[PDB]
Amino acid sequence: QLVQSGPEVRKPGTSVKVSCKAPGNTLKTYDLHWVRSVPGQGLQWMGWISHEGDKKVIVERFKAKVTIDWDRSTNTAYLQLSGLTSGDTAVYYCAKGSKHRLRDYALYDDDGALNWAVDVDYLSNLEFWGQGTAVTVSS
Amino acid sequence: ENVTEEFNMWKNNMVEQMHTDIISLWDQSLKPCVKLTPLCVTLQCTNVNNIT
Ligand SMILES: *[C@@H]1O[C@H](CO)[C@@H](O[C@@H]2O[C@H](CO)[C@@H](O[C@@H]3O[C@H](CO[C@H]4O[C@H](CO)[C@@H](O)[C@H](O)[C@@H]4O)[C@@H](O)[C@H](O[C@H]4O[C@H](CO)[C@@H](O)[C@H](O)[C@@H]4O[C@H]4O[C@H](CO)[C@@H](O)[C@H](O)[C@@H]4O)[C@@H]3O)[C@H](O)[C@H]2NC(C)=O)[C@H](O)[C@H]1NC(C)=O
Ligand SMILES: *[C@@H]1O[C@H](CO)[C@@H](O[C@@H]2O[C@H](CO)[C@@H](O[C@@H]3O[C@H](CO[C@H]4O[C@H](CO)[C@@H](O)[C@H](O)[C@@H]4O)[C@@H](O)[C@H](O[C@H]4O[C@H](CO)[C@@H](O)[C@H](O)[C@@H]4O)[C@@H]3O)[C@H](O)[C@H]2NC(C)=O)[C@H](O)[C@H]1NC(C)=O
Ligand SMILES: *[C@@H]1O[C@H](CO)[C@@H](O[C@@H]2O[C@H](CO)[C@@H](O)[C@H](O)[C@H]2NC(C)=O)[C@H](O)[C@H]1NC(C)=O
């Protein structure tokens, strides 16, 4: 299982922080995802930062106001929100999953080396999910 | 003067020797030239502008 920070209430305008912790260090090879769940509006994908540390994809719709960090030493996921508007009043879930790092077009060299490779990675699944943190913004 | 000699352009070996030569010089010059082996890659190509 996973642990998330407790429910939070924030006055709009300032920032909020959410922490997702794994028990000890048993989930390190798996990649990290953040999701949002506006009630009655389905679920949205906040973004992900992978597990090797080579990706930081965050959806552009939330790129400006949302940051996702990972502390290796404590093995802790950090989610920072800045705008904190009425639309952010919802439940944020931390998920641990796995991807498929396929190798697409790659330029081998004459001698047989690997000059470069786009090797774009594909999302496979999100096995482990946090208990969910409710963030309430009230004016 | 007063000299008669048979000739045979077809059995002549000068042509064979000079053909071998020309091949040798052709082989010799391009050896210290850039090897174009890092070009045989899949090319994405489109029809070309103002043409007839
Ligand atoms: C000749 O070149 C080809 C190039 O295509 C190469 O084949 C590919 O090799 C790569 C390298 O392993 C393969 O990438 C892995 O793929 C698996 C999924 O494989 C299954 O599904 C495919 C179809 O998509 C099937 O064809 C295949 O048979 C399998 O059924 C991924 O799951 C792997 O992901 C793991 O590694 C990633 C990094 O590489 C991680 O980011 C990812 O999170 C996964 O982590 C794994 O390891 C962790 C520890 O490191 C562990 O904790 C996790 O639980 C997890 O197990 C990986 O991307 C690719 O599938 C091959 N096929 C294709 C079509 O690309 C040949 O191998 C090569 N021949 C040689 C070198 O002899
Ligand atoms: C030899 O090969 C190894 C692995 O095979 C390479 O090691 C990795 O190299 C990649 C670069 O391709 C590194 O990825 C980059 O890491 C940066 C580290 O940033 C730290 O600080 C920021 C805050 O500024 C933190 O947010 C972050 O988590 C890190 O703690 C990132 O900043 C980079 O992010 C940038 O690029 C990504 C996409 O790549 C974008 O999404 C981001 O927005 C940002 O623009 C990037 O992720 C990776 O860290 C290396 N890992 C290790 C273990 O070394 C070697 O680089 C390679 N060496 C050579 C010479 O080829
Ligand atoms: C071959 O393709 C290249 C790539 O598109 C062409 O170069 C571009 O041409 C357009 C106009 O068609 C310019 O606006 C771009 O600035 C050019 N450069 C790039 C990097 O896109 C080139 O003109 C094509 N050759 C032709 C049409 O004969």
TrEMBL record, chain B:
Reported modifications of this chain: Highly glycosylated by host. The high number of glycan on the protein is reffered to as 'glycan shield' because it contributes to hide protein sequence from adaptive immune system. Palmitoylation of the transmembrane protein and of Env polyprotein (prior to its proteolytic cleavage) is essential for their association with host cell membrane lipid rafts. Palmitoylation is therefore required for envelope trafficking to classical lipid rafts, but not for viral replication.
Domain of life where this protein originates: Viruses
Subcellular location: Host cell membrane; Host endosome membrane; Virion membrane
Carbohydrate-modified residues: N2, Q44, N47, N50
Note: HIV-1 lineages are divided in three main groups, M (for Major), O (for Outlier), and N (for New, or Non-M, Non-O). The vast majority of strains found worldwide belong to the group M. Group O seems to be endemic to and largely confined to Cameroon and neighboring countries in West Central Africa, where these viruses represent a small minority of HIV-1 strains. The group N is represented by a limited number of isolates from Cameroonian persons. The group M is further subdivided in 9 clades or subtypes (A to D, F to H, J and K). Inhibitors targeting HIV-1 viral envelope proteins are used as antiretroviral drugs. Attachment of virions to the cell surface via non-specific interactions and CD4 binding can be blocked by inhibitors that include cyanovirin-N, cyclotriazadisulfonamide analogs, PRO 2000, TNX 355 and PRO 542. In addition, BMS 806 can block CD4-induced conformational changes. Env interactions with the coreceptor molecules can be targeted by CCR5 antagonists including SCH-D, maraviroc (UK 427857) and aplaviroc (GW 873140), and the CXCR4 antagonist AMD 070.
Functional description taken from the UniProt entry: Envelope glycoprotein gp160: Oligomerizes in the host endoplasmic reticulum into predominantly trimers. In a second time, gp160 transits in the host Golgi, where glycosylation is completed. The precursor is then proteolytically cleaved in the trans-Golgi and thereby activated by cellular furin or furin-like proteases to produce gp120 and gp41.
Domain notes: The CD4-binding region is targeted by the antibody b12.
Stated family: Belongs to the HIV-1 env protein family.
Subunit and interaction comment: The mature envelope protein (Env) consists of a homotrimer of non-covalently associated gp120-gp41 heterodimers. The resulting complex protrudes from the virus surface as a spike. There seems to be as few as 10 spikes on the average virion. Surface protein gp120 interacts with host CD4, CCR5 and CXCR4. Gp120 also interacts with the C-type lectins CD209/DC-SIGN and CLEC4M/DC-SIGNR (collectively referred to as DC-SIGN(R)). Gp120 and gp41 interact with GalCer.
Name of the featured protein: Envelope glycoprotein gp160
Residues represented out of the complete protein: 86 to 138 of 860
